[PDB]
From a paper:
[name] splicing is executed by a dynamic ribonucleoprotein complex known as the spliceosome. RNP remodeling of the B complex by the RNA-dependent ATPase/helicase Brr2 results in the dissociation of U1 and U4 snRNPs and the recruitment of about 20 protein components, forming the activated spliceosome (Bact complex). Conversion of the Bact complex into the catalytically activated B* complex by the ATPase/helicase Prp2 allows the branching reaction to occur, generating a 5′-exon and an intron lariat-3′-exon intermediate. In this manuscript, we report the cryo-EM structures of the human Bact complex in three distinct compositional and conformational states at resolutions of 4.9, 5.1, and 6.5 Å.
To gain insights into this dynamic process, we deleted the 3′-exon from the synthetic [name] with only 19 nucleotides downstream of the BPS such that Prp2 is unable to grab the RNA sequences for the Bact-to-B* conversion. Using a similar data processing strategy, 96 523 particles yielded a reconstruction of the early Bact complex at an average resolution of 4.9 Å. First, the splicing factor Prp17 and the NTR proteins RBM22 and G10 (Bud31 in yeast) are fully loaded in the mature and late Bact complexes, but not in the early Bact complex. Second, the N-terminal domain (NTD) of the SF3a component [name] (Prp11 in yeast) is present in the mature and late Bact complexes, but not in the early Bact complex. In contrast, SRm300 is yet to be loaded into the early Bact complex and the Switch loop remains flexible with no obvious EM density. Intriguingly, these two splicing factors are strongly present in the early Bact complex, suggesting a role of RNF113A in organizing the active site during spliceosome activation. About 10 proteins — Ad-002, Cwc22, NY-CO-10, PRL1, Prp2, RNF113A, [name], [name], and the RES complex — are recruited, forming the early Bact complex. The inability for Prp2 to bind and pull the 3′-end of the [name] likely allows the accumulation of this otherwise transient Bact species.
Author numbering:
A (entry chain 1): 394 to 449, 453 to 485, 490 to 1044
B (entry chain A): 1892 to 2015
C (entry chain A): 1391 to 1502
D (entry chain X): 171 to 194, 209 to 249, 257 to 266, 280 to 286, 293 to 316, 323 to 359, 378 to 380, 384 to 395
E (entry chain 5): 12 to 119
F (entry chain V): 455 to 559, 562 to 613, 619 to 648
G (entry chain Y): 8 to 111
H (entry chain A): 835 to 946
The structure:
Amino acid sequence: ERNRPLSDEELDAMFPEGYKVLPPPAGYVPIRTPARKLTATPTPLGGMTGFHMQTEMKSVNDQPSGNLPFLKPDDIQYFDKLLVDVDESEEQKERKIMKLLLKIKNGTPPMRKAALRQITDKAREFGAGPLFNQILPLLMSPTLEDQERHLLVKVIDRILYKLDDLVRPYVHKILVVIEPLLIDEDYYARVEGREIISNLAKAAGLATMISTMRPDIDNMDEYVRNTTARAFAVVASALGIPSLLPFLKAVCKSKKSWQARHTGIKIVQQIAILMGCAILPHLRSLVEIIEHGLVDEQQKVRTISALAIAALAEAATPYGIESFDSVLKPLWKGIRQHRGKGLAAFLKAIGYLIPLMDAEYANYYTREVMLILIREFQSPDEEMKKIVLKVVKQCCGTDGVEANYIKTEILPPFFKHFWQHRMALDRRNYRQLVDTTVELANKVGAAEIISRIVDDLKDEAEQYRKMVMETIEKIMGNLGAADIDHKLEEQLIDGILYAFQEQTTEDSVMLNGFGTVVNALGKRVKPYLPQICGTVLWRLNNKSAKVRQQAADLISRTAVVMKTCQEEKLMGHLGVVLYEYLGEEYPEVLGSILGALKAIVNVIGMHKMTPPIKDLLPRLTPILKNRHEKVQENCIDLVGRIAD
Amino acid sequence: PFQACLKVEKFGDLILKATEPQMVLFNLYDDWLKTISSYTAFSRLILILRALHVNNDRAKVILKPDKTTITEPHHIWPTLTDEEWIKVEVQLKDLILADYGKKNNVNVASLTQSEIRDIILGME
Amino acid sequence: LKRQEAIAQNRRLTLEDLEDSWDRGIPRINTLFQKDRHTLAYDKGWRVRTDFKQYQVLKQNPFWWTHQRHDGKLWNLNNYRTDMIQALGGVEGILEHTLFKGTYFPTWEGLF
Amino acid sequence: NLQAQEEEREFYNARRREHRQRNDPGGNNKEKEVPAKEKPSFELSGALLEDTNTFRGVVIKYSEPKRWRLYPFKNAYLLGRHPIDHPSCSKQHAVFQYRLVEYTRARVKPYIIDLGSGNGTFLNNKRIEPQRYYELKEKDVLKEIDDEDEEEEEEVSD
Amino acid sequence: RLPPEVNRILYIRNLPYKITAEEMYDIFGKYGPIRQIRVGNTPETRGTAYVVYEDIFDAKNACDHLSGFNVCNRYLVVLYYNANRAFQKMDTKKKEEQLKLLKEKYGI
Amino acid sequence: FRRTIYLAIQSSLDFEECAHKLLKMEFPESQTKELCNMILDCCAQQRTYEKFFGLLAGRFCMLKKEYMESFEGIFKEQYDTIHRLETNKLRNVAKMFAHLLYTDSWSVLECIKLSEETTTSSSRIFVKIFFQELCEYMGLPKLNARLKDETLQPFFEDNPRNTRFAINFFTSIGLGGLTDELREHLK
Amino acid sequence: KLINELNEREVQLGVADKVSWHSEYKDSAWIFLGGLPYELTEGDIICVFSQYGEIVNINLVRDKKTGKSKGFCFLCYEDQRSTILAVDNFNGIKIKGRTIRVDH
Amino acid sequence: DTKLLILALERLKEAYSVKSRLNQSQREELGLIEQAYDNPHEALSRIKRHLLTQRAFKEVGIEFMDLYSHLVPVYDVEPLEKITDAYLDQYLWYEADKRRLFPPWIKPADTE
Amino acid sequence: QRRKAEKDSERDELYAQWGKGLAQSRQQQQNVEDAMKEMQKPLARYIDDEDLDRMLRERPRYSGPAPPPNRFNIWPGYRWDGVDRSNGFEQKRFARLASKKAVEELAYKWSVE
Amino acid sequence: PGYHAPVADPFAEHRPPKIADREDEYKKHRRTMIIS
Amino acid sequence: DLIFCRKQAGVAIGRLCEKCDGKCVICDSYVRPCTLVRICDECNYGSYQGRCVICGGPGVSDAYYCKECTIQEKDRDGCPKIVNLGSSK
Amino acid sequence: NPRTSNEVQYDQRLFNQSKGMDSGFAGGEDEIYNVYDQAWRGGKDMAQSIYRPSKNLDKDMYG
Ligand SMILES: [Zn+2]
Ligand SMILES: [Zn+2]
Ligand SMILES: [Zn+2]
């Protein structure tokens, strides 16, 4: 590995200019040769160290000139040239003055600003060569920060708004550091990266990019192949699909090795994701490229291929069905014979396809897919479950599918295998599950789905409760509460109160959930009020900072319902009770209180306010000093409503 | 369930051994009133009695879980800490509700809080 | 001794065999197990700096002699509170002097 | 009815297990739980280098009775043929793994352990059988039969 | 049991302008055999040196014990030297002859 | 009665005051068993050994002849719970009887026995401590006297085996300087 | 690889035990070890995974004709908490250079 | 080094731990110490720079704490020199204890 | 076909009883013994005999070294390799849970002020 | 003392609160990339 | 870094979030909402359904143009959905 | 190859319980309070929630 012995040309390869190799003796060199043998031998021998008591020059260097903001102990290696104070005697003075970088990296924000401009206007002067030579090591640094990274990205942008023909030799030398930005956990890092590669490719020439980036296609590591694929995606967004087509179409037919074709196909995909809706014109040519990989002897190429078809169709949302046409008949056939991930991938593709077919052809074809779809619910693969999930959305969310068939065949296994505590803890699986369940409700109706998932409101874990809660929310949002019967409605309101009574974190899902449930139920909720508001007051105490704000907001969103049903005692309650909390010292609570008052003002009118405005308003007036935000917001709002 | 209170070994034994009509006193709260309110001790009491009334010996499993758990002669029920009391209370609620729903063929995760409170506390 | 027996057994010691002495000893043996213990191993002369804090800082420290981080907590008064409440007649009798029945709280078990 | 099934099973060690768990090659003689260097055990003895216990090695070429070097044992050691073995030996009779010398705790005491070298090893011109730790005492001698070299052990004193 | 960033090369600084490679080889020669050592002979780089060993763990024990180690009045700056940066001054070539050799001698 | 005792004892500094407070109250005498049972339990149950609760039990004896008896009884009552009590409170007891017995509130011991036959590993530790405390006062010489005139048998014998258990066990305790004569007897 | 990030969302959010997704099962000992090295065999994987329990019986899938491992094994312990411990613990492990996967 | 600097900074933070609105100079002290946590190596280098150079410091405030018997001098320094001096002290005591400078008979000692 | 269908079916009994957790089943069994205690011991307190001996004491199994602590405290099997192979999530999970306990206390210390 | 010495970073606590490593074992091959 | 996409204006209605709700897009002003916003489904699609024209949150309302930009006829140019000069997501 | 170390040293469950450094307790200010280490009752001590219902555990462990 990295410990493999080296050669003197390889030795001259690493270190920069201006250093000498030394023998001191031939004898000390023979000590260095015996040192290996003596690393074992002399370590097994007499040795020790000691110190004597005796009375006692101390040179050192920070970065002095006037100021020179501080150097981390490692960064010395980069900035050492600045440390020496030799000054005032060509290019060496341009590298020396280029340490303004250091002012960009570390220092006060003003130093970073002024430095940044000063180096922007010196672009044309210094040229890209010295800059990148003195930058790319820093942006390559193993100790690099988050901020420092981002800032060096900024300077690379700002200098690349100017330099155009100049960067041609450095393009690859740039991308090598930049392509790792495309695959990252941070999103803003990704949009930045795509931006600066856009500026680079458009900045340089097409042939510059192409001729540059070929050798990374067959590179042994797949990492560079992947991030390189996303690179071609970005540059293709820059210079357009048709310009870059013949390159690709040449790549996917390369007869050398498969890895290339794998890369190029991945490129087709990432183009599909990036360009998205705008793929539309060249969709045909793209398909005509990719189609030849589905039948290939290698597996990967097949998998990633069909996946790329998926991405296409998903950005192809319905149009261009016949362009996918010739692709189908193999795919369906493959649907029969496959085991493992490739199968699921095909299911992904076909899944996004079906909405694009005709309800007659897609009738047959769909009815065929449903079987395998059923059988495959049970696989432990989470990739599997994602795919087959979204599939069930598209297949069974089709207007040309019959309710009763779903009600019988699907729902029982669906709620059996899919609703479990493996899913909800994950993020994507959470969301997608929510959506699919929402759509199944959109077809089979409301009372079914809800009726089966109500009992889970009372389940122990939060995240699960959160999941079924937001599900009920969206469902009753779309279909309406009219379908719901009586008993299941009792289980509803009790479920929602119960779940709402235990809140580990502060979040809207439970609240918006409750509000939507009630406003959807309309005045069918009336018998349930006293239980509600009893809970609302008792919770309205509890232990302060957590739940006060939340119960308050609950009032705020339940105002209109507590109004139209004409419970006036309740308005007395909320009016003077909330009136009393206006002396609460915790701002985050008080804000929610004022909000609740606001919502109560928009239901019961001016002259009917149980806390007559003469009381209220001057009691509000002193609060305006309150600094912290939410108070000022809601307060000024309410003073606005009443003042208006 | 003041009847099941005589299922306890001490009371039933005392009565069956009694040779004359006589008034005897007991404290069913033991020392609880030190750490808790009266009424809450009353809820704990009802839980204990009812639970003795339904599954009997299994409630005794809850109340006599570990042989290192002891009961003092001055007291009717074993000495426990507040954490321990909350746990055994949950277990007793579990006994009552589980068997009620087992008799009435009801899924007892579906019952309400009002229903549960009624079932435990008395006749609905 | 507990270290030596652990050495000969090769099995490291658990919490329970130390549960006996856990709070006991002038160094307050539990102070070995402080999370930040490293840092404190490199602190020296703390006890004298506390003596000279009276000159650096205006306020008057009664606890100057010790520090809980090196020496642990040398007393536990938790009993004194319980016995105090007992001597006054228990929770209820005390509350009988208060407004508590005014607040209409069901119980005092949740007073916070 | 000779071989019913052609494969069956194993229930046996894997080369990558014992491989990965010991590598300089893979080695044998993983140190026991006791092993500790001698100097720190002279620190728990409260001994500066003057009164400390350091085992120095002494060489005599078996044909001619002194020092090609002198070796400390204080800094276990792998006695082998030379690269893998730390204590390399020019002796052409030593198997690629010949023997090992581990200081153990019973007190900090020196121990010699044969790895089952094909020829063997002689202790005071008297061999020891393989696969057991054999304590060594000062002035004892190492070379199974007549061996291009000799060795002696000395504690540091006087 | 090592951090990946450390490498067989160490950048060493806070050196005198008179310093001798005899002291260099002697001192640094404790931890292992020297692959080689360079020293700046140029106006800016005078006072700096690079040490390279046959093995990394050599350098690890080095920076372990040699951390802030003393020479003359000075405490040397001992850091693990970076990689890449300025390289391409040299090229990738001359692989053909050696690879032809290993393809010839062993025949593989 | 049990609660009043606790409050009177927790209230008073010194050990003198609690007796005065307690006697003063003139609570009924027969209970003069359980009361003292109270003191032995109340501190021993209390977390760590404290000098106060042990002194109190003793004075309460010198004032009335019965109180002494009440104690010796309560020491007997231990046999049943010699195994049963958990291995802290033995640390309070062993000493805690150590301080009644160094100061003469010894032969009541004899009831206690050394056998693998019946001794609780609890009881093993109990007695173990009891000596490692009482020794530390009398200093193993006055203890030589007190034993030599004691005639403690179930402890000190037949049963050469039990003489290995005895003598060995007092090499384990570590004192084992009052085990000599028995060593000779082994021979 | 996805497991370890589910255990991090389970620990980070303060899931607190029994709602744990190992309570998903309660019925099952047998564990799934995929991505195993081909040189491995019964006695080996038994010796490594008897760490967290006592494994009663394991069937490792080895291709019938060639008689070599297909690369994964279904195992069965004597104890479930051994399974919970093993999935939650032994996963993401290096063996012979390749990281094994485990799950219920 | 980080160990020492951390200890000293905590020590300084301990005087203000109750933290009412304090005042301006104190505010400077909290903000500057807080600064020292974020960029420690900066603080250490600045400190060593002071220790190698500056021989002239700023004026110290003085006030008397009143014990009603004997007054106690109280000194006030600018925060920079307080952090510098503090690290100087943790370091000096640390090296001192390592080297066994002070014989045992000097006993405002850490051990007891 | 009786003995054969009882090879497959009685193997459904065998691998069915084996499937779940042989270790788990025995623990369940112990509870069954507990029910027996109830019939004779309706409301046991103290000195009654089971408690007596109870407080009157206070198949290869793996030998070597020690087995790192497992939340559930299970000694490793007979022939276990004797080497810790883990992600360390136990410790860290083990350590973190402990840390929280410190957190609840230093959370409180806050409250009095 | 030697026993307490047998019982013998927070800056690495607060400093690591600034930024992060964030990355897996798969991505760190970045560190092996030489310039052009 | 931030500039219009200026693809052809379709029939799709504009969608603004909480934040941007009141703003007329080009004049940056709240005055005299009059006419209505149109952007292409190329700019508004999918995850962009009911998305903010600006920040990328869910649209709670519809943008109205001012009278100022009306008479100067700027509302008739390419779809004024701002694209960052990276992707749009 | 076992993973061995000299001696044993200590377990883990405890080896990281109490805070670190922290330092005593203010210069010694009056305002602090802080005399008691644990709260009085178990109302807020005993659990985050006094009540949660379910028969999930019930009907699972029931059989
Ligand atoms: Zn557009
Ligand atoms: Zn917006
Ligand atoms: Zn406008």
